[PDB]
Amino acid sequence: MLKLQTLQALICIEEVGSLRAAAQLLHLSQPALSAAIQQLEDELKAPLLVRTKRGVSLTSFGQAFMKHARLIVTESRRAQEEIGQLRGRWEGHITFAASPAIALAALPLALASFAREFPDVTVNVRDGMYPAVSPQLRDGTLDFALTAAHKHDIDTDLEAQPLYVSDVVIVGQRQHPMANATRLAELQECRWAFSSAPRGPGAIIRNAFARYGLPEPKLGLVCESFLALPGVVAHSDLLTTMPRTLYERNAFKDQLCSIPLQDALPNPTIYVLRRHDLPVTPAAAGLIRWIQHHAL
Amino acid sequence: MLKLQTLQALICAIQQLEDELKAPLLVSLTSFGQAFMKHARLIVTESRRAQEEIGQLRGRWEGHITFAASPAIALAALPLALASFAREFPDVTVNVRDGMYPAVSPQLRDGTLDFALTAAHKHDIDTDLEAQPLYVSDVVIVGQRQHPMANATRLAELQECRWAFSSAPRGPGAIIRNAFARYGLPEPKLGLVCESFLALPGVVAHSDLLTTMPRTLYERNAFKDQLCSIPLQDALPNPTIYVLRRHDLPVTPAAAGLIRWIQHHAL
Amino acid sequence: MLKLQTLQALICAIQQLEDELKAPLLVSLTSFGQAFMKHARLIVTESRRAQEEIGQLRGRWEGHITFAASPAIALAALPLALASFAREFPDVTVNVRDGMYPAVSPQLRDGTLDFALTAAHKHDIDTDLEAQPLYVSDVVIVGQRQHPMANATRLAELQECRWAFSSAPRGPGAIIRNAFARYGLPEPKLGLVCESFLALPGVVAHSDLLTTMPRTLYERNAFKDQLCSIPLQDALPNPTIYVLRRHDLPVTPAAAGLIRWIQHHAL
Amino acid sequence: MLKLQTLQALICIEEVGSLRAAAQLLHLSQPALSAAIQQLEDELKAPLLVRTKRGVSLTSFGQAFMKHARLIVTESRRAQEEIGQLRGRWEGHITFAASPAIALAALPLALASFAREFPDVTVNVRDGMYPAVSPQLRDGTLDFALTAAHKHDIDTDLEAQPLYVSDVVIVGQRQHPMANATRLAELQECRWAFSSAPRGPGAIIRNAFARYGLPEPKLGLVCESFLALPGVVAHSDLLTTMPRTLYERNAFKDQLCSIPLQDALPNPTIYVLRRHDLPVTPAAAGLIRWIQHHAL
Ligand SMILES: Cc1ccc(S(=O)(=O)O)cc1
Ligand SMILES: Cc1ccc(S(=O)(=O)O)cc1
Ligand SMILES: Cc1ccc(S(=O)(=O)O)cc1
Ligand SMILES: Cc1ccc(S(=O)(=O)O)cc1
Ligand SMILES: Cc1ccc(S(=O)(=O)O)cc1
Ligand SMILES: Cc1ccc(S(=O)(=O)O)cc1
Ligand SMILES: Cc1ccc(S(=O)(=O)O)cc1
Ligand SMILES: Cc1ccc(S(=O)(=O)O)cc1
Ligand SMILES: Cc1ccc(S(=O)(=O)O)cc1
Ligand SMILES: Cc1ccc(S(=O)(=O)O)cc1
Ligand SMILES: Cc1ccc(S(=O)(=O)O)cc1
Ligand SMILES: Cc1ccc(S(=O)(=O)O)cc1
Ligand SMILES: Cc1ccc(S(=O)(=O)O)cc1
Ligand SMILES: Cc1ccc(S(=O)(=O)O)cc1
Ligand SMILES: Cc1ccc(S(=O)(=O)O)cc1
Ligand SMILES: Cc1ccc(S(=O)(=O)O)cc1
Ligand SMILES: Cc1ccc(S(=O)(=O)O)cc1
Ligand SMILES: Cc1ccc(S(=O)(=O)O)cc1
Ligand SMILES: Cc1ccc(S(=O)(=O)O)cc1
Ligand SMILES: Cc1ccc(S(=O)(=O)O)cc1
Ligand SMILES: Cc1ccc(S(=O)(=O)O)cc1
Ligand SMILES: Cc1ccc(S(=O)(=O)O)cc1
Ligand SMILES: [Cl-]
Ligand SMILES: [Cl-]
Ligand SMILES: [Cl-]
Ligand SMILES: [Cl-]
Ligand SMILES: [Cl-]
Ligand SMILES: [Cl-]
């Protein structure tokens, strides 16, 4: 029998006056309790109980022992209570960062399903991209981050699981002079709104121009805000690069076109990043599952 | 004495700087290095603004402007102001980012931002910052188009709802929390916290969570047809959007030009 | 339910404990593991005391006593009390360490110490602890034997001196700081801080630093001939040394025996 | 010329009305200042100064430039001031741990000499031994620790420099029955006061008994306090092991003897331990030097 059950039973025995009554009250087997008490007495090398006409009383030894037994039972209960309070607070909240692509399609659908499964959980969704999320992830504030990244850039102490392989698209105002272009070379005369990338503003288009043997793309402006980007492009002759999800889901869709080139652009891999050592709550694990699920 | 050329490298020789300070700056930045960095940023950015301004006074309109914009600004006036600015000043490099008060303050103080366009409570604004009113905005309560409370007209009717606490100068959910409080209601029941304005409309469209947002954002997002605004007849705040700057920094001619175009289109 | 055998291993199977708690305990202890440890220590130490006490009630005088002793105790009464105790109780294992209030408190609370012998201010003593007066001590001011102020008779004459702030229940230098304050003097000028009573006499003997120490320590150290006590006629405190225990823990027969010998020799 | 000197000079020029007067006031060479200003003007592509009958005035351009120059000069001064405040507080205090051997001989002599060289420095000497000092050393609270250690036990991220090779001695009451012993084997019947060691209470004597092919030494008691140890031994028949310095320097010398065996005991190496990456203040470096000096 578990020692704690045996101590709890002993406290009950003192209270109700009988080993048989204690076992029944606590839903323990009588023979198992009687054996467990005997085993404990053999270990202590003294009897804890003496028979009387109508039950058992504690012996002098059991009296002394009981003072400790009560402290041990209370302490076990308090420990369970403190841990429950601390685990409840840990398990009851999620803080993570999400990139625009996740934020715009999967995240909305994932949160509703997540909430049905984990009704008692608060979510704190931050705007975030690597490597800005790297240090927030590193101290413990962020439970995980969801972002495009180049696998070989990710800090060695971070775990990384592929979430979805994304699309990027070149976007301009709906009547842009270069809308019919099929080659990146045909865009050399255009000016660019450099957008946010893990490798810095304009990293994608600059890398594209480079691998195609073109000069540096002409900087029109730097727009780190994906929120602002579609509107800014819609009201200019600037071209930009954005996640396909943002092109599909923005307030200026009717004022914009994509320029589908026969030249290839990257398909950024979006990763779930966590600190490797950290243990993961049920809810955080469930949310990731739900986000995975809706990232078809 | 400090060598100013070395500062623009620290942000990116060091031993001479460490010897000038007589303290370690690198080990990652030491505790001294972090304290040192805010100063080095102001010195470097001021030095660049000084040179750019002189070129502008000579008719060479080149240089840099870096600024932050809160969501309503970014969606309405900003595309039009950036377009007009680019026509008048074709050779100035502009860098726009998202930002909200008070998160923008340290970046106004170290000169990394020329200005920020953001809602703020006037009495909360730090004394070293100037605040020029730009816009008086409108806030609405938003839910999925078929929300159970889509036809509610009083805050009281929304008591049992869960909220996507949205971001604000006084913290997430501050407008709804204060509104609930002023109207004699208990704390708004939180469903989740959503800092991201980009993500918020879609999160609300695919849940039963209510939120508060600038009327601009309600009228300009990708989920408009899946959303509604609650037809409240209880009054909500109208936040003032300001142009915020560190007051003692002289505005460059180019940044003054952009602020002017922003003021024009906001009006 | 917890398995008590596993607790005595955690201090030194785990997955069953982690599953019982439903929280990670190891990763180094997790934040839960640290919170868990104080409880596990009390449970394990109480379990051992319970068994030892029963053997003692049966005339088997074996078991363990672990206690802390402040410097004056350790030097005067303790050698004589441990000797007398060992004669009466030859088979009990005793473990003595240095310790002072309030540093000893958590170790009284988690059962790792049966008791502590230490100076304390009665009104500072935490409500779950019992305090039994043991000794009223004497404090002296000490300096190198040829100190410029060796013949000073008033605290006022020591104003310009530098102090080896020595350790105390209210913090380093607390007795001299409070004495200076009560006598209407400025803060004592600190020369250095010396936590170590073992090192203090030798540090004072080979510098011009004054300190305060228990009269016992002054009369019992290896640097006596190189030291003096300042013949002050201003009054200094006489700290009470207590036997401190966590009150709700039943004292074992063996520990009661040792406390008795300690009380005898202190008297 | 340093740009900051040039800006400071420019501010002075505005104030005193003349480049010549500014150079003299600031103790700068006139030709060097005139060249530095010209160089700056060439870089700005505008003149900062215009000649008048009795000096120079700022041009319109210099006026605009001066507003920035003043902010830059002030900021440089404030930076120096903040760093000075932070460095002064860093350099003005030392916190370290010291073991009994150090604490009893070298430390006393080292502190006086240290104080003459670094009068403006507060020292905070903690009682300490490895590996208890290991974590205090690890977070930043301790600047260094001075302790016996086994080289191969020391945490890999800690630097360790040998300070002194120590002696340990077996000690008993002055008339101990085994005082004339010459072999460890002759002490097998004795009971021991287990003393503090880096490897745990009684580690040294237990290791000694072991390498000599003897049984476990008989435990009399555990005395973790080196302060209490000499007195406890003096009033018993217990034997112990202690640093030679403690045997030489304690209040019970007349009541104690050492038992100099022909069998060898260890000579623990005392190390200065620091975190490897951490930069070291002049004072802490000086104190270590002084402690090294007095550890002959
Ligand atoms: C065990 C026990 C003790 C005493 C009695 S009595 O004789 O009936 O009082 C009966 C049974
Ligand atoms: C079974 C049982 C045992 C003892 C008694 S009594 O002697 O009347 O208390 C009654 C009934
Ligand atoms: C008569 C009687 C039988 C059995 C017990 S018991 O051992 O406490 O369960 C008490 C009294
Ligand atoms: C450049 C870039 C930015 C963001 C993303 S996203 O993580 O798929 O939204 C992909 C690529
Ligand atoms: C960045 C990004 C956004 C959207 C998509 S898509 O889901 O493949 O259309 C891919 C990548
Ligand atoms: C921006 C970006 C991120 C990631 C990749 S990927 O390495 O092909 O997954 C390519 C481009
Ligand atoms: C609550 C709130 C958040 C943000 C704005 S905004 O500055 O107009 O985008 C106004 C009001
Ligand atoms: C100088 C200037 C630039 C741009 C415009 S705009 O065409 O109205 O945007 C008007 C005037
Ligand atoms: C400091 C300060 C000034 C003003 C206000 S307010 O009146 O609530 O906006 C609050 C706090
Ligand atoms: C620029 C701008 C910001 C905010 C609004 S409003 O909130 O819809 O009134 C309108 C226009
Ligand atoms: C995180 C989260 C997502 C969705 C909801 S709910 O749609 O209001 O039930 C609540 C909480
Ligand atoms: C200040 C002070 C420190 C320590 C003691 S003791 O507890 O008597 O050793 C008494 C007084
Ligand atoms: C029981 C007992 C033990 C020891 C002594 S003693 O010789 O006075 O220390 C007296 C009495
Ligand atoms: C709580 C408390 C009780 C008593 C004192 S005392 O009177 O200064 O010793 C101080 C503080
Ligand atoms: C045990 C003991 C402690 C303290 C003193 S006294 O401080 O010298 O009076 C004497 C004896
Ligand atoms: C650290 C330190 C400070 C002061 C002195 S003293 O000059 O001998 O008083 C010695 C040692
Ligand atoms: C440079 C300079 C400017 C003006 C005069 S003035 O003609 O004597 O006033 C002399 C010299
Ligand atoms: C050298 C010198 C230059 C100019 C004058 S002034 O014309 O009288 O001001 C006097 C002397
Ligand atoms: C007459 C005169 C000569 C030189 C200068 S200076 O160039 O400002 O030093 C000012 C005035
Ligand atoms: C066991 C032991 C403890 C302490 C020292 S000491 O560092 O030389 O004092 C050496 C050996
Ligand atoms: C631990 C310790 C203390 C003292 C000495 S001694 O300096 O070599 O005598 C060595 C070692
Ligand atoms: C306790 C102790 C510490 C260190 C050494 S040593 O490894 O030989 O320096 C031996 C024994
Ligand atoms: Cl039995
Ligand atoms: Cl607000
Ligand atoms: Cl203008
Ligand atoms: Cl005190
Ligand atoms: Cl007793
Ligand atoms: Cl020029």
Are A4 and C5 a contacting pair at CB < 8 A?
Answer: no
> Which residues on chain C are in Cβ contact (under 8 Å) with A4?
1-2, 4
Site residues for ligand 3, CB cut-off 6 Å: A 18-20, 54-56
Question: Which of A158, A146, A97 lies closest to A125, judged by CA?
Answer: A97
Give the H/E segment covering residue D206. helix D203-211
Cβ-proximal residues to D102 (8 Å cutoff; 6+ apart), any chain: D146, D147, D163, D270, D291, D295
**Cα(A296)–Cα(D257) distance, integer angstroms:** 83
Using CA atoms of D183, D185, D189, D194 in order, give the dihedral in degrees to the nearest 10. Answer: 80
Are B3 and D3 a contacting pair at CB < 8 A?
Answer: yes
Contact yes or no for A294/A106 (Cβ under 8 A): yes
Residue D21 annotated in ligand binding: no
> Which residues on chain B are in Cβ contact (under 8 Å) with A202?
none
| Number of the ligand closest to the Cα of D249 | 21
Distances, alpha carbon D275 to alpha carbons A292, C123, C125, D134, D288, in Å: 43, 41, 37, 10, 15
Distances, alpha carbon B170 to alpha carbons A223, B107, B165, B244, in Å: 26, 18, 12, 16
Cβ-proximal residues to A83 (8 Å cutoff; 6+ apart), any chain: C21, C22, C23, C32, C35, C36
> Which residues on chain B are in Cβ contact (under 8 Å) with D60?
57
Is C79 near ligand 13, meaning CB less than 6 Å away? no
**Helix, strand and coil in chain C, % to nearest 5:** 40, 25, 35
Query: Can you read off the two tokens belonging to residue B243?
Result: 């142009």
Are C46 and A86 a contacting pair at CB < 8 A?
Answer: no
Contact yes or no for D134/D140 (Cβ under 8 A): no
**CATH code, A1-92:** 1.10.10.10
- Ligand 15 centroid to B80 CA: how many Å? 86
Domain A166-267: CATH superfamily, name plus number: Periplasmic binding protein-like II (3.40.190.10)
Amino acid in the structure at residue D34 = S
Contact yes or no for B54/D45 (Cβ under 8 A): yes
Question: Which of B133, B186, C46, C21 lies closest to A65, judged by CA?
Answer: C46
Are B55 and D65 a contacting pair at CB < 8 A?
Answer: no
What single string gives the DSSP state of each residue in B167-228? Answer: --TT-TTHHHHHHHHHTT-PPPEEEEEE--TTTHHHHHHTSS-BEEEEHHHHHSSTTGGGEE
Same fold, A1-92 and A93-165+268-296: no
Question: Which of D264, D255, D254, D235 lies closest to D170, judged by CA?
Answer: D264
- Ligand 14 centroid to C113 CA: how many Å? 25
Question: What is the 3-state secondary structure of A88-117?
Answer: HHHHCEEEEEECHHHHHHHHHHHHHHHHHH
Give the H/E segment covering residue B93. strand B92-98
**Cα(C75)–Cα(A85) distance, integer angstroms:** 46
Fold of B137-238: D-Maltodextrin-Binding Protein; domain 2 (3.40.190)
Bridge pairing between strands D256-258 and B211-214 = unpaired
Out of A64, A75, A279, closest to residue C42 by CB: A75
Measured from the Cβ of residue A140, the count of other Cβ atoms closer than 10 Å reads 11
Domain spans of chain A, in order of start: 1-92, 93-165+268-296, 166-267
Contact yes or no for C122/C220 (Cβ under 8 A): no
List, as ranges, residues with CB under 5 A of the ion ligand 24.
Answer: B 168-170, 174
Max CA pair span of chain A: 106
Query: Can you read off the two tokens belonging to residue A279?
Result: 């243990």
Bridge pairing between strands D122-127 and B211-214 = unpaired
Bridge pairing between strands A93-98 and A144-148 = parallel
**Cα(C100)–Cα(C108) distance, integer angstroms:** 12
Minimum distance, in Å, between the CA of residue D199 and any CA atom of chain C: 15
Minimum distance, in Å, between the CA of residue A122 and any CA atom of chain C: 19
Bridge pairing between strands C92-98 and B227-229 = unpaired
Deposited experimental method? X-ray
Contact yes or no for D70/B83 (Cβ under 8 A): no
Q: Which CATH number fits domain C64-136+239-267: 3.40.190.10, 3.40.30.10, 3.20.20.70, 3.40.309.10?
A: 3.40.190.10
Contact yes or no for B137/B238 (Cβ under 8 A): yes
Rounded to 5 degrees, what are φ and ψ at D272?
-90, 120
Are A98 and B205 a contacting pair at CB < 8 A?
Answer: no
**In sequence order, which ranges of C122-222 are alpha helices (DSSP H)?**
174-182, 200-205, 215-219
Max CA pair span of chain B: 69
Are A45 and C36 a contacting pair at CB < 8 A?
Answer: no
**Cα(A231)–Cα(A242) distance, integer angstroms:** 13
Contact yes or no for B216/B137 (Cβ under 8 A): yes
Distances, alpha carbon C256 to alpha carbons A17, C53, C65, in Å: 31, 11, 10
Question: Which of B140, B193, B186, B191 lies closest to B162, judged by CA?
Answer: B191
Question: Which of B31, B68, B59, B62 lies closest to B49, judged by CA?
Answer: B62
Give the H/E segment covering residue D109. helix D107-117
Residue B164 annotated in ligand binding: no
Pick the residue whose CA is nearest to atom 3 on ligand 22. Answer: D268
Contact yes or no for D15/D32 (Cβ under 8 A): no
Rounded to 5 degrees, what are φ and ψ at C120?
-165, 155
Query: Can you read off the two tokens belonging to residue A252?
Result: 């200026």
Contact yes or no for C94/C65 (Cβ under 8 A): yes
Query: Can you read off the two tokens belonging to residue C265?
Result: 């020799």
Bridge pairing between strands C92-98 and D218-223 = parallel
Bridge pairing between strands C92-98 and C63-69 = parallel
Contact yes or no for A86/C35 (Cβ under 8 A): yes
> Which residues on chain D are in Cβ contact (under 8 Å) with C207?
108, 111-112, 115
Rounded to 5 degrees, what are φ and ψ at D123?
-110, 140
Fold of A93-165+268-296: D-Maltodextrin-Binding Protein; domain 2 (3.40.190)
